[PDB]
Amino acid sequence: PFRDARAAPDPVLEAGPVAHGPLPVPLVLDNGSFQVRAGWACPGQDPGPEPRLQFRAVCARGRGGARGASGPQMLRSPFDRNVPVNLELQELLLDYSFQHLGVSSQGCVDHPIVLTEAVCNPLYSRQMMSELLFECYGIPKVAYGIDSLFSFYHNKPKNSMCSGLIISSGYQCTHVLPILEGRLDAKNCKRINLGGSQAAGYLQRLLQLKYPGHLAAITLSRMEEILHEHSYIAEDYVEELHKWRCPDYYENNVHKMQLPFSVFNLAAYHQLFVGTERIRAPEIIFQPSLIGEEQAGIAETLQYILDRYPKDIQEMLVQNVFLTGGNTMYPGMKARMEKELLEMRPFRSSFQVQLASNPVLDAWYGARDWALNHLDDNEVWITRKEYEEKGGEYLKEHCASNIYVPIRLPKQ
Amino acid sequence: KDPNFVHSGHGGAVAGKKNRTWKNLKQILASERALPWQLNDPNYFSIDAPPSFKPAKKYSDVSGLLANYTDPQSKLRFSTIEEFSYIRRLPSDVVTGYLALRKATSI
């Protein structure tokens, strides 16, 4: 059967668990369209003791304005396509995180932060975000970096310059990030405009049209369970679905995902038999024409971005294919990726496919390790006063952050 | 209490006829395309993946098995004789569902 999801934990804190040593201790903030997660950087502690505040990045407020259910409690989200594009909800989303993390005393957030952002971020979105973050929250210095390259930075052997493909896959996008001696090669980097949200929406739509007898009993928040728990990506899809064609293998693998009970009852309380549906939804990021989209998908994009390099520099980045983000939770994801890669590498040539030590939380642990290592750097952070002489589109180009384009934004 | 009490007017629709939030992503991209970009610059839209170079494999609607066939009436695609015996019994409510589920000609 399904479970049901948690709500309303009590992660309340003091003015803040501010660590010893130098005065600043930064917040580590990860923003993505599935979940926000945030914690103090906890310097001098080798394992992060708690990536605090795991909660769904979706919020509600009363029709008289009287209360705001920002935490895990219909609802709305401040992102579009895994970039933040909001003010009036983005503030109450930040407020919830700071209020649970602890606020020191005065009319600003106390101490510096690393805030995770989209691969490329539209200049206006970083401007709107830095404007919120300096006008309302007043942070003394700020770092912007990428969830994917942070999770890579954690999974590195060392504080060393590296080359690789980051195969990222968040809630509403999956991106192939080629990197060259720590620099994200944003000139020829690519993304597929699909992810876990669209695979879960597809898995909902499949079971809606399979079971019109109870369109209300299935729901997106239950599809998120069977998509994480019981779905798997094929070793190769046209062969997996061929072994699903025979009733003996089908009956051995079709899942009794029962609805909660009050004819054999199943007309109202079905076992919701999922068979090829526990494959189809995972395959969306490899074959997005399953949801009708004409995008090249994660296998042909990896070929298309890779073959644009000189042959002698394709090797030392296929030497670190790095799988990361929420969809890489699927069992078999490494085993699929190394086949899709063997089918396109030169005949004898080596490749290496690494999976993030945690498929998703390593974005935050990466931003933590990054902030801990870069805490006392000057040139690496946007310092508060720089926002009076740079327009808020500005970026510092540290490792695990995007290219900066010398530019300005007109506004009134 | 809180990190602020006098939150500034960042540029949502404070009192206009338009919706309260900022410009949506399509409007951010439509305005970002007006900037003095060079040909090599990391534009957020230039990161879009190619259109697929392969023709996309036909997977059946009702069961996900490889589809050799498409129905002249319902335009669903199917793999076996008993799947046709099911597709012709479906209500139009879900036929227009499965076509829209892969964004086919159904509107």
Add this chain to the structure above:
Amino acid sequence: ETEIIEGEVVEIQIDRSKVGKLTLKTTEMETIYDLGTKMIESLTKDKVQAGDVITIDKATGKISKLGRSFTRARDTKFVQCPDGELQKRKEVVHTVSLHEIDVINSRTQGFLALFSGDT
């Protein structure tokens, strides 16, 4: 193993390379197929028309027609539509004499010497 299509052709459409679209029916299913160029230059070449029953060797594009279906015997032999699915993975057993392999190997079209006696 052999790929055979068989059915009554229900409807057939062609237009200018060339693009076109064919439909077939068994007693138990229907289909619409877009046609590739080397099918267009076969369905048109063999003058296939709606109400014919046809068998297509898919790998070669040969149209073995079987007359017209009984539901279009109004306005050639007549026959009932094929049963089962349209595209069958048939298995064909085949037998060739050891001499008959010896002769196929003898000339540019050695197999005529099976019949003509030139062997």
Add this chain to the structure above:
Amino acid sequence: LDPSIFESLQKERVEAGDVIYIEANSGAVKRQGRCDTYATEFDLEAEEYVPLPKGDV
């Protein structure tokens, strides 16, 4: 390839996406079918589609 092997590809009516056997001593060439990744290129085409070889290049 030398131009005489290319004449043989052209006599075998080979195009991009065909599965080919080349022998580098004999200069023998055989088309074996279209690679089945293109088997959806038309719904019926008068060709045989073979799966991409499960063997060394």
